[PDB]
Design an enzyme around this catalytic site. Structure first.
Site, mmCIF file in Angstrom:
data_model
loop_
_atom_site.group_PDB
_atom_site.id
_atom_site.type_symbol
_atom_site.label_atom_id
_atom_site.label_comp_id
_atom_site.label_asym_id
_atom_site.label_seq_id
_atom_site.Cartn_x
_atom_site.Cartn_y
_atom_site.Cartn_z
ATOM 1 N N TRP A 1 -4.933 3.184 11.647
ATOM 2 C CA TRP A 1 -4.836 3.001 10.206
ATOM 3 C C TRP A 1 -5.242 4.302 9.509
ATOM 4 O O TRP A 1 -6.420 4.652 9.548
ATOM 5 C CB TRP A 1 -5.717 1.851 9.715
ATOM 6 C CG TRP A 1 -5.418 1.631 8.276
ATOM 7 C CD1 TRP A 1 -6.042 2.205 7.215
ATOM 8 C CD2 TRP A 1 -4.363 0.838 7.743
ATOM 9 N NE1 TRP A 1 -5.442 1.811 6.045
ATOM 10 C CE2 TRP A 1 -4.409 0.964 6.344
ATOM 11 C CE3 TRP A 1 -3.382 0.022 8.314
ATOM 12 C CZ2 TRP A 1 -3.515 0.302 5.499
ATOM 13 C CZ3 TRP A 1 -2.499 -0.641 7.471
ATOM 14 C CH2 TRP A 1 -2.573 -0.495 6.084
ATOM 15 N N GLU B 1 -5.312 -2.239 13.810
ATOM 16 C CA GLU B 1 -5.814 -1.254 12.840
ATOM 17 C C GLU B 1 -7.106 -0.650 13.356
ATOM 18 O O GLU B 1 -7.970 -1.364 13.863
ATOM 19 C CB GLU B 1 -6.112 -1.860 11.466
ATOM 20 C CG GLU B 1 -4.909 -2.405 10.746
ATOM 21 C CD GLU B 1 -5.195 -2.866 9.347
ATOM 22 O OE1 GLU B 1 -6.257 -2.527 8.787
ATOM 23 O OE2 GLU B 1 -4.333 -3.582 8.796
ATOM 24 N N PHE C 1 -7.042 7.223 4.155
ATOM 25 C CA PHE C 1 -7.080 6.849 5.571
ATOM 26 C C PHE C 1 -5.987 7.519 6.414
ATOM 27 O O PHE C 1 -5.852 7.232 7.596
ATOM 28 C CB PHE C 1 -6.909 5.331 5.728
ATOM 29 C CG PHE C 1 -8.189 4.543 5.665
ATOM 30 C CD1 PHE C 1 -8.953 4.356 6.801
ATOM 31 C CD2 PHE C 1 -8.592 3.950 4.482
ATOM 32 C CE1 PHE C 1 -10.105 3.614 6.754
ATOM 33 C CE2 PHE C 1 -9.743 3.208 4.427
ATOM 34 C CZ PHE C 1 -10.506 3.042 5.563
ATOM 35 N N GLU D 1 -5.548 1.966 -1.264
ATOM 36 C CA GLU D 1 -6.608 1.260 -0.537
ATOM 37 C C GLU D 1 -7.148 0.108 -1.380
ATOM 38 O O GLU D 1 -8.333 0.036 -1.725
ATOM 39 C CB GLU D 1 -7.707 2.253 -0.144
ATOM 40 C CG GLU D 1 -8.939 1.696 0.597
ATOM 41 C CD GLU D 1 -8.641 0.878 1.838
ATOM 42 O OE1 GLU D 1 -7.508 0.925 2.375
ATOM 43 O OE2 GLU D 1 -9.588 0.177 2.282
ATOM 44 N N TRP D 2 -6.239 -0.798 -1.717
ATOM 45 C CA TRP D 2 -6.553 -2.026 -2.429
ATOM 46 C C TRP D 2 -7.454 -1.763 -3.640
ATOM 47 O O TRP D 2 -7.089 -0.943 -4.490
ATOM 48 C CB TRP D 2 -7.140 -3.021 -1.450
ATOM 49 C CG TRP D 2 -6.180 -3.275 -0.301
ATOM 50 C CD1 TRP D 2 -6.362 -2.915 0.991
ATOM 51 C CD2 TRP D 2 -4.880 -3.907 -0.360
ATOM 52 N NE1 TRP D 2 -5.284 -3.291 1.754
ATOM 53 C CE2 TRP D 2 -4.360 -3.897 0.952
ATOM 54 C CE3 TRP D 2 -4.118 -4.480 -1.387
ATOM 55 C CZ2 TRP D 2 -3.116 -4.447 1.269
ATOM 56 C CZ3 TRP D 2 -2.872 -5.026 -1.068
ATOM 57 C CH2 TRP D 2 -2.395 -5.009 0.254
ATOM 58 N N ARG E 1 3.684 -0.322 13.065
ATOM 59 C CA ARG E 1 3.349 -1.629 12.516
ATOM 60 C C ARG E 1 3.469 -1.567 11.004
ATOM 61 O O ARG E 1 2.736 -0.816 10.359
ATOM 62 C CB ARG E 1 1.931 -2.040 12.926
ATOM 63 C CG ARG E 1 1.423 -3.287 12.216
ATOM 64 C CD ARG E 1 0.082 -3.807 12.758
ATOM 65 N NE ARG E 1 -0.272 -4.990 11.977
ATOM 66 C CZ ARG E 1 -1.290 -5.099 11.128
ATOM 67 N NH1 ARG E 1 -2.170 -4.126 10.980
ATOM 68 N NH2 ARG E 1 -1.429 -6.213 10.433
ATOM 69 N N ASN F 1 -7.997 -6.078 14.174
ATOM 70 C CA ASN F 1 -8.378 -4.926 13.378
ATOM 71 C C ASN F 1 -9.866 -4.678 13.577
ATOM 72 O O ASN F 1 -10.670 -5.609 13.476
ATOM 73 C CB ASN F 1 -8.118 -5.155 11.893
ATOM 74 C CG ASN F 1 -6.658 -5.289 11.554
ATOM 75 O OD1 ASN F 1 -5.779 -5.078 12.384
ATOM 76 N ND2 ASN F 1 -6.394 -5.636 10.310
ATOM 77 N N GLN G 1 0.797 -1.218 0.000
ATOM 78 C CA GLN G 1 0.000 0.000 0.000
ATOM 79 C C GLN G 1 0.835 1.275 0.000
ATOM 80 O O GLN G 1 0.337 2.311 -0.421
ATOM 81 C CB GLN G 1 -0.954 -0.006 1.190
ATOM 82 C CG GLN G 1 -1.922 -1.166 1.107
ATOM 83 C CD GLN G 1 -2.947 -1.150 2.216
ATOM 84 O OE1 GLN G 1 -2.748 -1.779 3.245
ATOM 85 N NE2 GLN G 1 -4.063 -0.446 2.003
ATOM 86 N N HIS H 1 0.751 -9.532 4.646
ATOM 87 C CA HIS H 1 -0.308 -8.542 4.492
ATOM 88 C C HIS H 1 -0.699 -8.496 3.012
ATOM 89 O O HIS H 1 -0.640 -7.448 2.351
ATOM 90 C CB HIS H 1 0.151 -7.184 5.015
ATOM 91 C CG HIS H 1 -0.970 -6.266 5.403
ATOM 92 N ND1 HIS H 1 -1.005 -5.623 6.616
ATOM 93 C CD2 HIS H 1 -2.081 -5.875 4.732
ATOM 94 C CE1 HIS H 1 -2.094 -4.875 6.686
ATOM 95 N NE2 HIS H 1 -2.763 -5.007 5.555
ATOM 96 N N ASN I 1 -2.290 -10.922 8.338
ATOM 97 C CA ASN I 1 -3.258 -9.856 8.471
ATOM 98 C C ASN I 1 -4.594 -10.244 7.862
ATOM 99 O O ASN I 1 -4.654 -10.600 6.689
ATOM 100 C CB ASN I 1 -2.744 -8.593 7.795
ATOM 101 C CG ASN I 1 -3.717 -7.442 7.916
ATOM 102 O OD1 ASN I 1 -3.773 -6.792 8.951
ATOM 103 N ND2 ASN I 1 -4.500 -7.194 6.863
ATOM 104 N N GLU I 2 -5.660 -10.173 8.663
ATOM 105 C CA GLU I 2 -7.032 -10.376 8.180
ATOM 106 C C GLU I 2 -7.200 -11.558 7.246
ATOM 107 O O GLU I 2 -7.581 -11.395 6.084
ATOM 108 C CB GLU I 2 -7.561 -9.123 7.466
ATOM 109 C CG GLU I 2 -7.652 -7.934 8.354
ATOM 110 C CD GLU I 2 -8.574 -6.825 7.832
ATOM 111 O OE1 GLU I 2 -9.250 -6.952 6.769
ATOM 112 O OE2 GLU I 2 -8.594 -5.791 8.502
ATOM 113 N N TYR J 1 -13.093 -1.553 12.824
ATOM 114 C CA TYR J 1 -13.510 -0.280 12.233
ATOM 115 C C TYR J 1 -14.966 0.099 12.480
ATOM 116 O O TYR J 1 -15.277 1.278 12.597
ATOM 117 C CB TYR J 1 -13.297 -0.308 10.717
ATOM 118 C CG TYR J 1 -11.850 -0.353 10.266
ATOM 119 C CD1 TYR J 1 -11.156 -1.558 10.174
ATOM 120 C CD2 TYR J 1 -11.188 0.816 9.902
ATOM 121 C CE1 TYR J 1 -9.836 -1.588 9.750
ATOM 122 C CE2 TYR J 1 -9.892 0.797 9.476
ATOM 123 C CZ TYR J 1 -9.213 -0.402 9.399
ATOM 124 O OH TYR J 1 -7.899 -0.418 8.972
#
Ligand SMILES: [Ca+2]
Length: 483
Positions: free
Chosen positions: A438, A388, A454, A445-446, A101, A320, A44, A145, A189-190, A322
């Protein structure tokens, strides 16, 4: 006489306290040595995608395909952090961050995913690690990630157990190189998002589409990867290096729509399907029984050795978080057929909630508290890192750069979610040990590309200039106040 859309909990300590009231209180304090930080991921922010020996990741491949990324964006250059990392570390020093991180690009270190180390790639992460330490910032590292080496992706990626084996060997390399300095490791990650978006819905790399089986298989091999990396760490490095390792999992808080047992059950069930899917294996050694019974032959089974490898394979709980979703118990029998029908729940937002720059990001600060409390209860009071948490301000890219800096909504998000995290620490006794916002930087952002921002720090992608937003300054003062 059924109550709905009412989320207050009678008798909850500190329930009615506003963020302003929390921070105004002289008795508000955080744990000693609390790791206030910010988070990024390699693809990213780094750029330099095809320089200094880096091999392609599946996101390089994905981003080159017309239509996959909004507005035709790629991570080829991103924030050019590979070249500008010293400046970015100095920014973090200025903000007084206690910790950072970041993730390691697997294919920057091992271009094919296995075999020979790419010297310049390894050297970058050594240089970055040293720069952080030289500036008083605790480096913490995500091994995976989402930037799976393309060579491994071509051989099935997370649908192939070979990838889990390769991941363990890669973790081994990184522990040996950096573990004398890095003492907090995040394996994956996730894994939810990799499995669902990458292998199920196809919105993320590698772009595969199958919701019946792929999410469960991709989740399965990611868990085997986690177990392999932790096994290496415990057996070869942990006594000597004295660090800690865990996964970074993820979920919205799931709140019942109505005060009925059906909605309470549906909300709990979504927490199981999202989070316990990965955390029960890591803490208890196997998938939740209710998932095994529901999903049947679409859920792979762990071998006895794998259950042994998985149980107790975390020193802390990375999360993470949100947003919050409302859950309703379906009023008609839902058949188990695919991931979202399996969890037997109807998901919605309260229309009164504010939203970020994508529909999934509801602004619900108390979801932070409730999720943390849920984790404490189910996983026997683990050390928790909020790895995050952050906000994309709606239409921030359409603002003048000047206006984007006055990011009041992000200020309010930061303050709100941190205040509710504090409530979890103070009232609910959740052992939260750090918080990583984050993100440090506006970034890729993908599949949303660069349009979605962000950052605490604004990036001008034309010049690569960094400029602190209001939120960065608010965060700086927060950290200084609560050390
Ligand atoms: Ca060096």
């Amino acid at each position: 006489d059924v109550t709905c859309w009412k989320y207050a909990i009678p008798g909850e300590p500190g329930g009615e306290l506003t963020a302003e009231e929390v921070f105004a209180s002289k008795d508000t304090a955080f744990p000693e040595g609390f790791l206030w930080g910010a988070a990024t991921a390699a693809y990213q922010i780094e750029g330099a995608a095809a320089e200094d020996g880096r091999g392609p990741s599946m996101w390089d491949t994905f981003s080159k395909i017309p239509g996959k990324i909004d507005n035709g964006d790629t991570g080829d250059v991103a924030c050019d952090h590979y070249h500008r990392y010293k400046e970015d570390v100095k920014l973090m020093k200025g903000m007084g961050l206690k910790s950072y991180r970041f993730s390691v690009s697997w294919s920057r270190v091992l271009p094919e995913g296995t075999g020979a180390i790419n010297p310049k790639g390894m050297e970058f992460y050594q240089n970055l690690t040293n720069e952080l330490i030289a500036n008083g910032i605790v480096p913490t590292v995500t091994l995976y990630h989402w930037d799976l080496p393309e060579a491994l992706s071509k051989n099935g990626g997370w649908l192939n157990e070979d990838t889990a084996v390769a991941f363990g060997q890669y973790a081994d390399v990184m522990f040996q190189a950096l573990g004398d300095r890095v003492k907090l490791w995040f394996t994956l990650n996730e894994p939810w998002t990799t499995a669902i978006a990458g292998y199920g819905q196809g919105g993320h790399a590698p772009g595969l589409k199958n919701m019946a089986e792929n999410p469960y298989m991709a989740g399965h091999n990611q868990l085997l990867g986690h177990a392999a990396a932790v096994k290496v760490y415990r057996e070869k490095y942990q006594e000597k290096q004295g660090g800690k390792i865990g996964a970074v999992l993820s979920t919205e808080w799931k709140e019942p729509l109505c005060h009925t047992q059906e909605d309470k059950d549906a909300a709990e069930r979504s927490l199981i399907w999202y989070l316990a899917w990965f955390a029960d294996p890591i803490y208890k050694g196997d998938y939740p029984e209710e998932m095994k019974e529901r999903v049947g032959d679409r859920m792979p089974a762990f071998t006895e050795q794998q259950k042994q490898d998985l149980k107790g394979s975390a020193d802390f709980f990375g999360i993470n978080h949100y947003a919050t979703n409302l859950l309703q118990g379906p009023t008609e029998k839902i058949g188990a057929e695919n991931y979202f029908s399996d969890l037997n729940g109807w998901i919605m937002m309260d229309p009164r909630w504010a939203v970020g720059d994508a529909s999934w990001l509801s602004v619900v600060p108390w979801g932070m508290r409730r999720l943390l409390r849920w984790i404490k209860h189910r996983y026997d009071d683990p050390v928790v890192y909020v790895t995050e948490n952050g906000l994309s301000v709606p239409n921030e890219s359409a603002m003048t750069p000047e206006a984007a800096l006055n990011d009041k909504m992000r200020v309010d998000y930061l303050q709100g979610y941190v205040a509710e995290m504090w409530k979890a620490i103070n009232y609910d006794k959740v052992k939260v040990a750090g918080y990583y916002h984050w993100s440090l930087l506006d970034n890729f952002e993908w599949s949303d590309g660069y349009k979605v921002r962000f950052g605490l720090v604004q990036v001008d992608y034309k010049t690569q200039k960094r400029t602190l937003k209001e939120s960065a300054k608010v965060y700086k003062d927060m950290i200084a106040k609560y050390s």
